[PDB]
């Protein structure tokens, strides 16, 4: 049940809501008021999802799919079988997510650490809200949201993309991808760096942070350091997801045409717009 050093940490307090009421654990897990909140939202949501599955007449997970209301319903409510169920399920997800974040906050307090983790998570939550709330509202129907199904959701991605041409040309999409790639690069390195120091060549002594900083200056002439790389990671990650939201929130709202075409602005600057030759002249 407890890690060899856990007991002295399991003291009362830190709860945001409800005092000592839910201030307790279940196996390794911490409950807290929000422990309960998330459970309830999670229970409800899964139920509704199964209920959608009978109306659909399949129990096969590769097939199950809960779709939003069709565009004709705009931002109004829709019949269960006709889009209501997704709308509730979406409400329930949100409930789950936010609650899961606030529990993280409550654990943070009991342990006496910073709130960076709940913090970073809120970016994930905000990306999800962008795709099922902010964008549809702004566009004008729940129908612009993505459906909850394993492959159907990949389909929405593909269809929504190809609507504006090759989505690769969405400029904030370019930026968002550069982080995803960069972050992975940096996670690759960080991990590798620490391990190689902690697990040197056979029979040698554990290296030191000094060796870590040296290994990299030797390699590329600079080392961001231990505090740095952790600051870096958090940032690349949060940024990747920040730009991911951005590229979507603008798509279909302030730009509805082909993304490639938006680049004509550059190429049509009057100082070289008419100069012959090249690719565009």
């Amino acid at each position: 049940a407890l890690l060899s050093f856990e007991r002295k940490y399991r003291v009362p307090g830190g709860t945001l809501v409800g005092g000592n009421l839910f201030d307790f654990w279940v196996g390794p897990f911490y409950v807290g008021f929000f422990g309960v909140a998330t459970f309830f939202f999670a229970a409800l949501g899964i139920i509704l999802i199964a209920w959608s599955a009978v109306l659909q007449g399949t129990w096969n997970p590769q097939l199950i799919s809960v779709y939003p209301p069709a565009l004709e319903y705009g931002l109004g409510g829709a019949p269960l079988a006709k889009g209501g169920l997704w709308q509730i399920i979406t409400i329930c997800a949100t409930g789950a997510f936010v609650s899961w974040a606030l529990r993280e906050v409550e654990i943070c307090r009991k342990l006496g650490i910073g709130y960076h983790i709940p913090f970073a998570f809120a970016f994930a939550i905000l990306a999800y809200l962008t795709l099922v709330l902010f964008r549809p509202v702004m566009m004008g129907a729940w129908g612009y949201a993505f459906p909850y199904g394993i492959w159907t959701h990949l389909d929405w991605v593909s269809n929504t993309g190809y609507t504006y041409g090759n989505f690769h040309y969405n400029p904030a999409h370019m930026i968002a991808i550069s982080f995803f790639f960069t972050n992975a690069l940096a996670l690759a390195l960080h991990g590798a760096l620490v391990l190689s120091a902690a697990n040197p060549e056979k029979g040698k002594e554990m290296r030191t942070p000094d060796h870590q900083d040296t290994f990299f200056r030797d390699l590329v002439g600079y080392s961001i350091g231990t505090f740095g790389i952790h600051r870096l990671g958090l940032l690349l990650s949060l940024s990747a997801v920040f730009f991911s939201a951005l590229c979507m929130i603008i798509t279909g709202t302030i730009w509805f045409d082909q993304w490639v075409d938006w680049w004509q602005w550059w190429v049509k600057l009057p100082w070289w717009a008419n100069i012959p030759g090249g690719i565009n002249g």
Binding site: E6, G27, P28, R103, C108, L111, I113, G114, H116, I117, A120, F121, S158, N166, H168, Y169, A184, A186, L187, A188, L189, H190, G191, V194, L195, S196, A198, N199, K204, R207, T208, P209, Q212, D213, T214, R217, D218, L219, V220, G221, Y222, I224, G225, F227, G228, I229, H230, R231, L232, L234, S237, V241, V267, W272, A273, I275, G277, G278, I279, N280
Partner: protein, 298 residues
């Protein structure tokens, strides 16, 4: 917090001197106070050596060989060059020449030169990551991690073009052109979303962000107990390591150790291009259309 609120400087650190040939290391560079906020302010020194120079020279040759081609396309006009910079493209030889090294220069030869340059550039730099580690007596994690990346690149412009029978199947050097090639590569193989490696690869990419978010915010959350000093924490568990592990145990039911978390890390990132490489390799050599394959499984 996230940024330093006070900077401290001392004599330029010339670093540990294991078996390193000190004759090759450079001189210390300036110090960016700018940089000093996010992380270390000290620039340099850097280790040159034979492999560094070869790598660094081939590296520039590659880049320049592409550059002259762009200029030739731009009508040597600096205005066009700027206007059309992302539209220019150095394309592989036509399918006609196959795996031939005899394609005319304007028709694909120049692409081979550039690639040859990149090949040497990249491999030498790989050997560089290895040696730099050896000379400090360190594990070779970094070189092996690097090898994963190299895998996907090897497959894209070398192994797959060769197994298909022609260089024309490789990726063109160009900003918009390599985007198009990607988009088109999926169309031709029946939508890469049905390539289960592609799907796996995305999971590990998404995951890398998830994890580096988790790890980073955690270490910052406990740097008030010297969390970032991970090597000593491994060697002698501090409350930092404890609060870290527990926050996570109490949230989701299990947890890492300080050495442990970094194994999760190196593997989550390395699996991105590992799986990736495989998904692409089978694409068009063994499987012509992932949707059809998806219907049968064979």
């Amino acid at each position: 917090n996230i940024f330093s609120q006070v900077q401290v400087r001392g004599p330029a650190d010339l670093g540990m001197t294991e078996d390193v040939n000190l004759a090759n290391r450079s001189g210390v560079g300036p110090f960016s106070t700018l940089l000093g906020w996010f992380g270390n302010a000290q620039l340099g020194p850097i280790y040159l050596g034979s492999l560094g120079v070869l790598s660094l020279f081939s590296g520039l040759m590659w880049f320049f060989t592409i550059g002259i081609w762009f200029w030739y396309q731009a009508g040597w006009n600096p205005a066009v060059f700027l206007r059309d910079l992302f539209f220019f493209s150095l394309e592989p030889p036509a399918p006609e020449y196959g795996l031939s090294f005899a394609a005319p220069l304007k028709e694909g030869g120049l692409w081979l030169i550039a690639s040859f340059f990149m090949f040497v550039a990249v491999w030498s730099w790989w050997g560089r990551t290895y040696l730099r580690a050896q000379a400090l007596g360190m594990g070779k994690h970094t070189a092996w991690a690097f090898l994963s990346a190299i895998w996907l690149w090897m497959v894209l412009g070398f192994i797959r073009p060769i197994l298909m029978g022609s260089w024309s199947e490789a990726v063109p050097y160009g900003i918009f052109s390599h985007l198009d090639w990607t988009n088109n590569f999926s169309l031709v193989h029946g939508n890469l979303f049905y390539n289960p490696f592609h799907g796996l690869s995305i999971a590990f990419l998404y995951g890398s962000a998830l994890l580096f978010a988790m790890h980073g915010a955690t270490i910052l959350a406990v740097s008030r107990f010297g969390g970032e000093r991970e090597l000593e924490q491994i060697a002698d568990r501090g409350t930092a390591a404890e609060r870290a592990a527990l926050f996570w145990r109490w949230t989701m039911g299990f947890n890492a150790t300080m050495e442990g978390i970094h194994r999760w890390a190196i593997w989550m990132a390395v699996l991105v291009t590992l799986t990736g490489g495989i998904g692409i390799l089978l694409s068009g050599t063994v499987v012509d259309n992932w949707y059809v394959w998806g219907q049968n499984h064979g």
